[PDB]
């Protein structure tokens, strides 16, 4: 049967801003496939869905962490005990969300990507979500997450380097996250700045062969890489 | 024991924008009382909580209804069947949210309000939430909701008229919702415009006895009543 229906429901879920439902709908598109790949449209929806569901918990996690620290500085110890419990609950959510998208990548989407844009897309996403585990996980789970990120970003760059134009927003967007993760989580500015400037230089080397729709895609990203290189200096 | 804790958790829930949790926390404050009333702070949190939880479903309901109608006009009948199912689900949520706050008003907060500001506050809220049932319920449930609203708004105005200054933001805010409900749901512009201009005129009759904190409260509302009277003409 046709489940353009679940795709149509996911676009309604998006319009309604009911993102948890958007995820369940795109998870139903993905776990119903035999040999078929998600279209671009479909993989983009799955990604908008997870990005909005994880975004909201990341933002809760950041305000709850600021409060946790302001109250720790003031010696308000009953508050801290309460904030910690709340942070713990949000961490539980964050960790199950990451596990849901990782499980779908590891066992449906990555093993069935054929084109290279697809392989880079799913391997980047896998990295993106291990990076999110790494922002809050602790101990050995933080270490396994930082390594899973690096190794997914690397396997993605290997394929992006050969099989995708230097100007492709997947390859540029992979460069942006990879460069930021080297700097912010591995504390390696040399590397961060390097593959940033590499991704930028390479992509102006062929910027003189895009459309008026192809441009707005990768120009947005190219400018993000640029303001970081000047920032990072 | 002290459950300033649940109040503190509700303020964390608000900061995190986890409003469903804010509701559960303020519901726990309210269902734990013996003879005690919610403070102003507490009744305001309960209200911020329910307002954000119902706001998000009302907004989903409005975009899903616009889509439902655009697709009905274009003859896209598979879409409509899908949109209707989605609208139905959002209606289920809206109806259980309204029932939760109504159950807490009808059986904890209204029967124990002592001061009059408190009685007007809970009776207004009861009206506010029956008004929301009336926006989407259908048939006899819509009729029982429109009447429950009217009768809660009336019982509230009876008390606001004697026991609260004409300038009190509860009494003015009650006037705003009451006036809007007469116009938009009962289709009675004469009445809408009347008790709007009455609430405004009466409140400038004593506007020359407020603070610099008391003012910003009821001026915001007084200007809302004013732009409607000119609009409604």
Describe, in short, the structure shown.
With 233 residues, chain A is mainly α. Chain A contains 9 helices and no strands.
User: Which oligomeric state applies?
Assistant: homodimer
Most extensive interface between two protein chains, with residue counts: A-B, 21 and 21 residues
Structural class of chain A: mainly alpha
Q: Tell me roughly what share of residues is in helical segments of chain A.
A: over 70%
Second CATH tier, the architecture of chain A:
Up-down Bundle
- Globally, the shape of chain A reads globular
Report strand % of chain A: under 5%
Number of DSSP helices of chain A? Answer: 9
Largest sheet of chain A: none
Secondary-structure element sequence of chain A? HHHHHHHHH
> What would CATH call the class of chain A?
Mainly Alpha
Number of strands of chain A: 0
The CATH topology of chain A comes to Delta-Endotoxin, domain 1
Specify the CATH homologous superfamily of chain A: 14-3-3 domain
- Total domains of chain A: 1
Radius of gyration of chain A: 19 Å
Distance between the termini of chain A: 55 Å
Organism (chains A, B): Solanum tuberosum
Protein name (chains A, B): 14-3-3 protein
Family (chains A, B): Belongs to the 14-3-3 family.
InterPro entries (chains A, B): 14-3-3 (IPR000308), 14-3-3_CS (IPR023409), 14-3-3_dom_sf (IPR036815), 14-3-3_domain (IPR023410)
């Amino acid at each position: 049967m046709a489940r353009e229906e679940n795709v149509y429901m996911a676009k309604l879920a998006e319009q309604a801003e009911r993102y948890e439902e958007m995820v369940q709908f795109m998870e139903k598109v993905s776990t119903s496939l035999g040999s078929e790949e998600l279209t671009v449209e479909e993989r983009n929806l799955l990604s908008v869905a997870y990005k909005n569901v994880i975004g909201a918990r990341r933002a809760s996690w950041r305000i709850i962490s600021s409060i946790e620290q302001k109250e720790e500085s003031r010696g308000n110890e009953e508050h801290v005990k309460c904030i910690k419990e709340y942070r713990s609950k949000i961490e539980s959510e964050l960790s199950n969300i990451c596990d849901g998208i990782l499980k779908l990548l590891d066992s449906n989407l990555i093993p069935s990507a054929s084109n290279g844009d697809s392989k880079v897309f799913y391997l980047k996403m896998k990295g993106d979500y291990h990076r999110y585990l790494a922002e809050f996980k602790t101990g050995a789970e933080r270490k396994e997450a930082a390594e899973s990120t690096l190794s997914a970003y690397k396997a993605a760059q290997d394929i992006a380097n050969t099989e995708l134009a230097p100007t492709h927003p997947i390859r540029l967007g992979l460069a942006l996250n990879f460069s930021v993760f080297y700097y912010e989580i591995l504390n390696s500015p040399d590397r961060a700045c390097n593959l940033a400037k590499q991704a930028f230089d390479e992509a102006i080397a062929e910027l003189d062969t895009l459309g008026e729709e192809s441009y707005k895609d990768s120009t947005l990203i190219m400018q993000l890489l640029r303001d970081n290189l000047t920032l990072w200096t």
